[PDB]
Amino acid sequence: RRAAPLGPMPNEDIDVSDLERLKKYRSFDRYRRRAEQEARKPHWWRTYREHFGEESGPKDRVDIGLPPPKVSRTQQLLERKQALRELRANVEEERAARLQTARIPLEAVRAEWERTCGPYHKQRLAEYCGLYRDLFHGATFVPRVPLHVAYAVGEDDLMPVYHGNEVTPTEAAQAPEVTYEADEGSLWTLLLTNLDGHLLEPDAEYVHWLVTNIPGNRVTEGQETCPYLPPFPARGSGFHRFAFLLFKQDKRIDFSGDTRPSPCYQLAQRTFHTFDFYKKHQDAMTPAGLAFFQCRWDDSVTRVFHQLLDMREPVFEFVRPPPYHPKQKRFPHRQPLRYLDRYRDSHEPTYGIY
Amino acid sequence: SKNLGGKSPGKRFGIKKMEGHYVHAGNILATQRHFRWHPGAHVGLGKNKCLYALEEGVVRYTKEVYVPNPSNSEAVDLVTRLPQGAVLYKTFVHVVPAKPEGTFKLVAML
């Protein structure tokens, strides 16, 4: 019995007859490129992604953020071509490229990167780390404005907080310094949220530093709704994510429900839901800055748990599922002598009546 | 008379677990004389071309592109001899893991 294909066959387009006049690729790299391009297409048969989680394939993501900057593409391409021609007109650059001795201004490269295409890379990195999935669950934004957060470890020691870095709680004990370019006519809100670390609810997150109504760039002038709290991740469950979200707002938002007390050491009061927060403040707030980092347990989390939170330090462990063993047979045929040890409760001799 | 030695039992070369079967680690998925089913995710390859599960999960069978090892000279030669639009496809067997790697249990609240 034969069945008809439910769509087009893979190699049905090229002509089988007269193969010599047909061009071939003599490069394993060419074939690998062609194969990796063909493997990403939505075939009608059972594929690997369909079973191993393409995440519902294509999804219409809601964009909640600032519009992209309207630039003149023609003038941009013109000035870029002019700069490239000026760079190629030199001779010392050609000598350096020929002699394989040429350096790169990594600082200027990073600056131009965060100026032109850094936002999209940060957006995709946050999508990979699962920030949007746990902050809005249906919407991903683009960090249009940059956000430079840095912790002070001493007098000349400044540790930055990039998109996905690892910062020790000892370095993150004090409140960090934030920077971002903004005119003196806008208002901003900064929110440090801990996605993992809530002991009671899995679907909730913790607050660490919430300060709204920021005039321009002066973050210290704005009223802090939630005082700064150092990261306190458990000893067993490590590598929690802490995200600084910066929202730009239009009106002078005033709220008495989201306000925290000055001590603010109650974990029941420090329970956040960024989805409901943005649902409440969706009219004015719009997220424009984002900076998330990883954090594990260190010797200061015990101090934070005992002195500040007035708790006992909870210690977890990564346990594994028990090993699978079949149903024990009465007469295990041709099994080794150690078959009887796989079903032993304890390695202790038990004398029933003796 | 003249024809001798034609008597030999079948080696039972076949597919043991079908698609959808919940298997465990070490379960032989399929045995073969030549490469009919190729291993994919969480499916090992014995020296007798047999396929066994490396994780505990559900067996799946897919049709996927074939990029051979750049050292296997015959396969690389066939690849470079293929036309410009040809792409080799093979039947791969995968094991979709069901049980998680582990959980975080509270052992002591000191």
Binding site: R1, R2, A3, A4, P5, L6, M9, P10, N11, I14, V16, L19, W45 | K63, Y66, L78, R81, L82, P83, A86, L88, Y89, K90, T91
Partner: peptide, 21 residues
């Protein structure tokens, strides 16, 4: 399989031949 719609998806010997007046 023969009766499946994906029969002959690995068919490749027709794309290469490796066996004048």
């Amino acid at each position: 399989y023969r009766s499946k719609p994906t029969h002959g998806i690995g068919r490749y010997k027709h794309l290469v031949k490796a066996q004048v007046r």
